[PDB]
């Protein structure tokens, strides 16, 4: 089991922090499904990888 560190980087300045636990790919996938819910009111987004992939930044526009 692993923990995915995710910086929820909103356009209007705010940065929310979240952690997803599970198999690397189950958490990462859950991470995106999450950002997919936020985008429904936060706007389309983009992502970049840090820490070999265990950390991901999701910037909304």
């Amino acid at each position: 089991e692993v923990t995915i560190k995710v910086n929820l980087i909103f356009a209007d300045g705010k940065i929310q922090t979240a952690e997803f636990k599970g198999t690397f790919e189950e958490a990462t996938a859950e991470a995106y499904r999450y950002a997919d819910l936020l985008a429904k009111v936060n706007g389309e987004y983009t992502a970049d990888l840090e820490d070999g992939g265990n950390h991901m930044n999701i910037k909304f526009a």
């Binding site: 705010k14 922090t17 979240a18 499904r33 999450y34």
Partner: protein
């Protein structure tokens, strides 16, 4: 056994934000999903059931939505009392299963830890064991790492640590790490060092003490 996937595991927000906690079920459950809130050392409290009906005494900022296999709990605007851990639960069929829970913490700004090291008390050194303690005060975020060194020797499987809950005032954390060993091993080394790492540190901070030097 209907599988419950509650996410995120933890979330850091600041008073006033909109919070969204989702719960996904393996198979349909119609609407029989319930949300509970729990605080340190306290019994949980029912928040919403039937996926959307609120329990009396619950502030309208708490709403629920969803049917079938996907549900969402929404806190319109995060309040100080809203910081806690949240759990979803299906009650469609036995066995009842809970979500893994989502811990909603108070986001604050970076803050470096104050470190201290303590030699095992001599009164304890007669009991055979000798624990070396190293405390890290008020820091944020929660991620911190302590690495013990005896005469420059990395140590494994002989240290334990505990992290306090977010402080009521400054929303920071503290950490106690103990390197437990024996007067059999303790008295055979001199340099006892504690190496700390945190996002607030540019390079690892160290605190040590050579035995029989105080």
């Amino acid at each position: 056994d209907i599988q419950m996937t509650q996410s995120p595991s933890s979330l850091s927000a600041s008073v006033g934000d909109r919070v969204t906690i989702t719960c996904r079920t393996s198979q349909s459950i119609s609407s029989y999903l319930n949300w509970y809130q729990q605080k340190p050392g306290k019994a949980p409290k029912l928040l919403i059931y039937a996926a959307s009906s609120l329990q009396s005494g619950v502030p309208s900022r708490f709403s629920g939505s969803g049917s079938g296999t996907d549900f969402t709990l929404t806190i319109s605007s995060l309040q100080p009392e809203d910081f806690a851990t949240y759990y979803c639960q299906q009650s469609y069929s036995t066995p009842r299963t809970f979500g893994q829970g989502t811990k909603v913490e108070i986001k604050r700004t970076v803050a470096a830890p104050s470190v201290f090291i303590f030699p095992p008390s001599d009164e304890q050194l007669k009991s055979g064991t000798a624990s070396v303690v190293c405390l890290l005060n008020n820091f944020y975020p929660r991620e911190a790492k302590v690495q013990w060194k005896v005469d420059n020797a990395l140590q494994s499987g002989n240290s334990q640590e505990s992290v306090t809950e977010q402080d009521s005032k400054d929303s920071t954390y503290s950490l106690s790490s103990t390197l437990t060993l024996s007067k059999a091993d303790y008295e055979k080394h001199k340099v006892y060092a504690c190496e700390v790492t945190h996002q607030g540190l540019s390079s690892p901070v160290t605190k040590s003490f050579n035995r029989g030097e105080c």
